[PDB]
Write a protein that binds this ligand. Sequence first.
Ligand SMILES: O=C(CCCC[C@@H]1SC[C@@H]2NC(=O)N[C@@H]21)NCCCN(CCc1ccccn1)CCc1ccccn1
Ligand SMILES: O=C(CCCC[C@@H]1SC[C@@H]2NC(=O)N[C@@H]21)NCCCN(CCc1ccccn1)CCc1ccccn1
Ligand SMILES: O=C(CCCC[C@@H]1SC[C@@H]2NC(=O)N[C@@H]21)NCCCN(CCc1ccccn1)CCc1ccccn1
Ligand SMILES: O=C(CCCC[C@@H]1SC[C@@H]2NC(=O)N[C@@H]21)NCCCN(CCc1ccccn1)CCc1ccccn1
Ligand SMILES: [Cu+2]
Ligand SMILES: [Cu+2]
Ligand SMILES: [Cu+2]
Ligand SMILES: [Cu+2]
Ligand SMILES: [Cu+2]
Ligand SMILES: [Cu+2]
Ligand SMILES: [Cu+2]
Ligand SMILES: [Cu+2]
Lengths: 124, 124, 124, 124
Amino acid sequence: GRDQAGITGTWYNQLGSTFIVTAGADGALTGTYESAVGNAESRYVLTGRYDSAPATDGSGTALGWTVAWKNNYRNAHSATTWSGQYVGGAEARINTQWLLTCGTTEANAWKSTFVGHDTFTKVK
Amino acid sequence: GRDQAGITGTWYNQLGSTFIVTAGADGALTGTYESAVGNAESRYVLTGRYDSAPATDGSGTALGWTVAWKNNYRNAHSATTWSGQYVGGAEARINTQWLLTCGTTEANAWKSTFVGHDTFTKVK
Amino acid sequence: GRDQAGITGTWYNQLGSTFIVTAGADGALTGTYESAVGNAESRYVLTGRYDSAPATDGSGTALGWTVAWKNNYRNAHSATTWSGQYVGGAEARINTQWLLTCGTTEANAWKSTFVGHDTFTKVK
Amino acid sequence: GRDQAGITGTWYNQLGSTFIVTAGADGALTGTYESAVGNAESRYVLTGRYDSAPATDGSGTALGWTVAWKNNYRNAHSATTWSGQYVGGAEARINTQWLLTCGTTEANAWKSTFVGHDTFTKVK
Ligand SMILES: O=C(CCCC[C@@H]1SC[C@@H]2NC(=O)N[C@@H]21)NCCCN(CCc1ccccn1)CCc1ccccn1
Ligand SMILES: O=C(CCCC[C@@H]1SC[C@@H]2NC(=O)N[C@@H]21)NCCCN(CCc1ccccn1)CCc1ccccn1
Ligand SMILES: O=C(CCCC[C@@H]1SC[C@@H]2NC(=O)N[C@@H]21)NCCCN(CCc1ccccn1)CCc1ccccn1
Ligand SMILES: O=C(CCCC[C@@H]1SC[C@@H]2NC(=O)N[C@@H]21)NCCCN(CCc1ccccn1)CCc1ccccn1
Ligand SMILES: [Cu+2]
Ligand SMILES: [Cu+2]
Ligand SMILES: [Cu+2]
Ligand SMILES: [Cu+2]
Ligand SMILES: [Cu+2]
Ligand SMILES: [Cu+2]
Ligand SMILES: [Cu+2]
Ligand SMILES: [Cu+2]
């Protein structure tokens, strides 16, 4: 993958969450996510995909991943997907927007989904 | 997984896209996605996660998955994440919202992400 | 406005909410919104804008509006914006996606915004 | 309005766009928007609403507004709604997420809406 080395490693967002990911040559993303906020403790499994043959015109590398918020400690009956792009360089970044859906009854489904945006850096 | 059997199988959305998924006992989602629209042809790898121990109060089961839009035929330099919940019953549904991020230059990053909503059913 | 007559009137969404709007020749939208769900009762002021000279190629008419959820009865310290398009015809529709932001502390701002989608029809 | 004075004035986002707004005592927002990017030139009418009696616990003030991208110079057949909160203090901010819907045919409606996030400050 073009940015396999760039993406693999430990990333941190503006909330202090820790995103540990391995990018595979086939376009796979695997790793763990630890949220500094919310109904969460310790690490959760994540899995996703990235464009392993991105454009060479300076564009970023599109990618996404999911965490379901169940582990051996807690279950928040919810999942978040981050959709974004990796931007290489001296200050590499993964810029994302995300959707956090909670399991609800049908009557509460209108209020089932939060939206936000996280920026991940290699430092902090 | 509580809804492992309910989720596993072939699903179709309102656009005619085909979502083929296997839910693992560990919370994994694997399979393929074929979009009826956009810069896409044939099947693409997907991976995601679901809550394998959902609440028993009638709430849905939270889940998400990602497709990076590269396969052996095309590369649209983009990825979509769907975030949603599975609702069991006679007319089972996966109700989602999604984020499609395209790789862009930094100057175009403000217009990098589409948002929408797909409903998947076992029929059609 | 091309769709001034089409847009003006009373609309209803899938939740049973009532959207009463007047489209002005200048592109203004004014009216009231009554939500069937949430921390809301009775009517709330809304204001927005629409494209008063849409394309003539069959495309919909882009529009948006805001409700702040304060009236003489309640204040939910939140606002929703709907962004969408009006589609004319025998079964006219306003198809929207929306963002509901609640006032939060800075520590809770990551969970300040819900996202959803409402479809409005002239009937129901 | 509690933050009538705080909100009224000229704001700038991270793209260099200019948001000129007057907050009314009744909860109204009026003004003009000039986008530094996209199919836009000069000023466009905006209108919205804000919570004129926010909580006093340190929470932000919820607000939203709409721009339809038609003026005397251009018509981009689209509208954006920003939904967010005003945060007062020495470095006052309006933190938003937004939805930009373009008029499309029904066949293209799945790709009608962009999502993003803008932060507005009194400086820059
Ligand atoms: O927090 C969680 C799990 C952790 C989520 C962390 C987020 S991921 C995006 C962001 N980037 C990041 O690094 N960290 C955060 N999931 C919601 C848990 C539902 N709550 C009750 C059910 C409900 C249904 C509908 C609407 C509201 N609630 C439980 C308490 C809670 C916690 C957090 C937010 C809201 N409610
Ligand atoms: O289509 C794709 C891949 C297929 C996406 C299918 C979507 S998933 C959500 C939904 N549910 C579903 O079942 N099917 C659809 N990815 C965009 C491809 C970018 N275009 C140029 C780059 C660009 C950058 C910024 C803004 C706009 N464009 C290429 C042509 C194209 C195709 C579709 C939409 C827009 N542009
Ligand atoms: O309901 C409201 C006002 C009514 C909103 C109705 C929505 S508009 C989109 C949709 N289409 C429609 O026709 N009707 C609905 N506003 C949230 C009120 C905040 N709650 C505590 C604060 C908070 C902060 C952060 C995260 C969660 N909460 C009060 C109780 C409540 C009510 C509804 C949902 C959630 N919480
Ligand atoms: O730009 C505009 C008007 C200006 C929008 C500026 C945005 S507001 C959010 C953000 N904060 C800000 O300060 N500034 C930006 N509106 C789209 C115009 C549609 N294009 C073809 C139709 C189409 C339909 C579906 C999908 C894609 N396109 C015309 C060319 C264009 C311009 C910009 C982005 C994309 N396409
Ligand atoms: Cu290419
Ligand atoms: Cu909650
Ligand atoms: Cu439980
Ligand atoms: Cu495109
Ligand atoms: Cu035109
Ligand atoms: Cu609430
Ligand atoms: Cu109060
Ligand atoms: Cu365009």
